[PDB]
Amino acid sequence: XXXXXXXXXXXXXXXXXXXXXXXXXXXXXXXXXXXXXXXXXXXXXXXXXXVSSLKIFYKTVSFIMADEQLKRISKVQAKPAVEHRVAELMVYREADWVKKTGDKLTILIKKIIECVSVHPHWKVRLELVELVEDLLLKCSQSLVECAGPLLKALVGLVNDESPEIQAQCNKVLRHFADQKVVVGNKALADILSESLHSLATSLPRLMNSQDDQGKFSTLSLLLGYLKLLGPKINFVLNSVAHLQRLSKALIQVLESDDLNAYFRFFTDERIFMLLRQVCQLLGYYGNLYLLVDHFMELYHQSVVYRKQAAMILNELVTGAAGVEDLHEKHIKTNPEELREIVTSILEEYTSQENWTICSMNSNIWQICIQLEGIGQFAYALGKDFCLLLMSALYPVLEKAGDQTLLISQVATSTMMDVCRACGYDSLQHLINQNSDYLVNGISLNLRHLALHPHTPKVLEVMLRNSDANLLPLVADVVQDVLATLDQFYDKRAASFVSVLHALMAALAQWFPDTXXXXXXXXXXXXXXXXXXXXXXXXXXXXXXXXXXXXXXXXXXXXXXXXXXXXXXXXXXXXXXXXXXXXXXXXXXXXXXXXXXXXXXXXXXXXXXXXXXXXXXXXXXXXXXXXXXXXXXXXXXXXXXXXXXXXXXXXXXXXXXXXXXXXXXXXXXXXXXXXXXXXXXXXXXXXXXXX
């Protein structure tokens, strides 16, 4: 009679629905029967449930009867009940929604319902249906009048942003939490959330101290939970215990590389965690002053906690910029306060950053992160970065130096950033923009601020410079720069700077130019003067470069110049000194008979060197560069020979020395290709025309 009982129950529910008393409360008893029956489509009939005090007494009975309801929900969590989930969920929703209006002491029933809800929280996304159900469940529950268990419930209602398909439902629910489901002006939920967040921010010292991707769960809970309190965090920030615990936590998480437009370090080996962390620090745009101040503190505190705080500050200001949207009835910050904060942080960064190999790359990390911070400051504060140009120009420009890849790369990026944010168009062009600042700054630095290595800033501004149309102003300072390590001329960091600026001016005048004449004159003058030093081949390099550039209209300067120069060289030259020979080859640009006699004396001296390859090829190329009319040097070369062979000054020098028929060198000894010796032919042929 299973079909008989089935049809009986079905037609009974049908007759109910066709038709619809105190004793009707005993109705719920059959609902108890309906709660654990054969359950084809059982619970349907229960839907006949629904100045309503009658409804209120029915709800009293139903509060007594929700025991079997929660039992069946847990059974669905254990037994199949793969579709009755939504049924019982909506049943509980309707029931618990039917009573919170007034005259509801119900504290005992309240605690019982809180126990039941804590039990029911054991359901989380069995399929699309279970998640979809729990969504509306939390929606209706948290929207009720007042309770105290929702501290747990609301928690999972925020961490529900991790599903596969229903994420839009959770998002639109959080959207709905704008004026009705509020953090708002209901202190109870707020303080319960604060109490939660406190233990949260006390755990992360340990939570991320374990395996990966489980920490993401906790950090995601964190980021969502903050996203709840869009505004109204100053109501929980203000407590000193909160800020202390949160700061001390975050200091240890961030302390394995980073990139440009934040990534953490040791024991955080996954990158999406780092993106979520920089999104959660960026989450703070409630108040600025408190945050920036309490973190500047942590920077000033010690050494091992610095880089973390720097990255923090970068994330904080970038968050203060503004790219998603939260509860949109609140207010935003002000540009002028941004100006104050950026001025402060930039001044501290610049003044603090100008200088155990572990500690050395540590300082490298420090300067790199500070440069990146300047870059982010430019990026966020794009427009109003104009009142404080120079404050950012000078530090990194002088820092644009030794470390090309890392340091100078981040530098270049920061400068093109301030360009594209302020319209400065290829940072080289920024030198062609306001420059007198740089001129006077470098000048007064080298003039008063002597004892400090301001060596490479001039290199960056003159060798990597733009067009030299500004050197006519720089000239005197250049001249001063020339006199710089030439008046006292007793300082290692000044003589090295003199050699540096020499190489730089040589390169610039080489490219930029083709005034400059006398510039190169005094340049070579001072260079040759200092050439008498020890291990200063830079003098030879600068000499070669200048001399190459100084041979356009060098009427008499070059003459006595090279005279005294080769004098001192012969005094000194007696392994890369052939570069001066290259300079001599550069001297071969416009050399004369004076250089001929000089090279004659040079060959006479080099004759002392034996007839003994690297050095053989060096001397070979040196002879072959110009070969300034060798007559006695002809015989010297005459008394394997690729250069002396390729000489080809005449058809009588090596040809006579080509009667060997030997083993090895003879193969190349008889390698004459063309004769072209018909001079007398045409000479006499002149007698066949006229």
Partner: protein, 440 residues
């Protein structure tokens, strides 16, 4: 113009010494002309530092005797005692750093620098009306100017350094500094030629480093002179002192305020010297004053007494007192809500709540009072938690206080008969005097 060659000739003569007559003549002549200032600027430093070095570090203790007719050391000093303003101090410091020997001119170097300070210590401040320069230069100049004390015995610290620094090591030097900032302040005040704030700005940058390392010498020995020099119809004095306390470098802004309120005489004079806007114009100062209110406590019985006193005094025309009241009460409700700070800060914010509760008389006594009363009582109920009665104690006393100054009619009187005699209101540790304080 041609003097530059003489300059060369000077350093020539200076580098070709033993020619007593020639060097005496050239040095006295150069002193004679120690309107174009450009070459006088190159002379002012670029000849000043070379002659200084080669005449102090290069010459042996026999130049003074080459021509002992009471003029050689005279011109030596008169080069370094006056003349060009800035570079003198700079090269002096740089040398005494580099020139660190047992004694060659060391004692005489100290005599030189001291005798310079003693007479005309301004020498830079008054000539601060400058256009602009490089920032690391400012850095070195100010840091030296304010660390001179510790910088001195580093190079030579011993019995001789002790007798050098047994009269003025601290406790006199910063006294000088304070005296000098006094003089230059009053000078730029009575000037009234062109409003500089440049000397003001520079001496404020001074006050910065001074406060951040020097702890408390200048506070009284500045404010009492400031009190005096402001108490009259001191238009220029008051305005310049305002602009001085204002543009203090925001980097610290905290030691300045901490000291300025700590040793100050009373609320009235503190309110007179700072300025009505200095707390309502520089938002960093908002943050300082009200973080001292909320976050920390230093002495707080007379200290925060005076601090909140000045808060109210300044708020004689600022409708900011109600906002700070609301925020204070909200923080009280949160700290009573959340796992709380230790008892010190608890008593601290308590006393703060009382003193700010002093001022009243306005509408809106409907809802703020409701939230405060309800939150406080609901917390104090369970606050003891069989854990530490003092915390509970705290609440109940402010109960009376809030009862006194929430709606003084009806139920509070019942409190006066129920929660004032049989409610543990017997201890006299710090209950009676703050209770009386509650009466404003």
């Amino acid at each position: 113009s041609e003097v530059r060659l003489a300059v060369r000739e000077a350093i020539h003569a200076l580098s070709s010494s033993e020619d007593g007559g020639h060097i005496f003549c050239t040095l006295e002549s150069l002193k004679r002309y120690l309107a174009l200032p450009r070459e006088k600027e190159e002379f002012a430093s670029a000849h000043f530092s070379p002659v200084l070095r080669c005449l102090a570090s290069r010459l042996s203790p026999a130049w003074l005797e080459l021509l002992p007719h009471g003029r050689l050391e005279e011109l030596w000093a008169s080069f370094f005692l006056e003349g060009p303003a800035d570079q003198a101090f700079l090269v002096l410091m740089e040398t005494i750093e580099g020139a660190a020997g047992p004694s060659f001119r060391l004692m005489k170097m100290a005599r030189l620098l001291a005798r310079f300070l003693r007479e005309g210590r301004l020498a830079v401040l008054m000539e601060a009306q400058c256009r602009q320069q490089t920032q690391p230069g400012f850095i070195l100049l100010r840091e030296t100017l304010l660390g001179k004390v510790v910088a001195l015995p580093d190079h030579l610290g011993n019995r001789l350094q002790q007798e050098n620094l047994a009269e003025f090591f601290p406790q006199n030097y910063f006294r000088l500094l304070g005296e000098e900032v006094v003089r230059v302040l009053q000078a730029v005040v009575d000037s009234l030629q062109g409003g500089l704030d440049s000397s003001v700005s520079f001496v404020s940058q001074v006050l910065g480093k001074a406060c951040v390392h020097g702890r408390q010498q200048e506070i009284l020995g500045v404010l009492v002179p400031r009190l005096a020099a402001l108490t009259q119809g001191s238009y220029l004095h008051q305005r310049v002192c305002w602009r001085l306390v204002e543009q203090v470098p925001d980097r610290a802004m905290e030691a300045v305020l901490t000291g300025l309120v700590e040793a100050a005489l009373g609320p009235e004079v503190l309110s007179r010297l700072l300025g009505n806007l200095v707390v309502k114009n520089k938002k960093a100062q908002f943050v300082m004053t009200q973080k001292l209110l909320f976050l920390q406590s230093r002495l707080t019985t007379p200290m925060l007494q005076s601090l909140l006193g000045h808060l109210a005094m300044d708020s004689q025309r600022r409708p900011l007192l109600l906002q700070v009241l609301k925020e204070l009460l909200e923080t009280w409700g949160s700290s009573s809500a959340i796992r709380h700070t230790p008892l010190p800060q608890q008593r601290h914010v308590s006393k703060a709540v009382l003193i700010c509760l002093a001022q009243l008389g306005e509408p809106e006594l409907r809802d703020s009072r409701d939230e405060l009363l309800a939150s406080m009582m609901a917390g104090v109920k369970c606050r003891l938690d069989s854990s530490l009665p003092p915390v509970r104690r705290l609440g109940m006393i402010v109960a009376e206080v809030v009862s006194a100054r929430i709606h003084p009619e009806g139920p509070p009187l019942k409190f006066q008969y129920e929660e004032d005699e049989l409610s543990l209101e017997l201890l006299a540790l710090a209950s009676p005097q703050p209770a009386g304080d509650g009466a404003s």
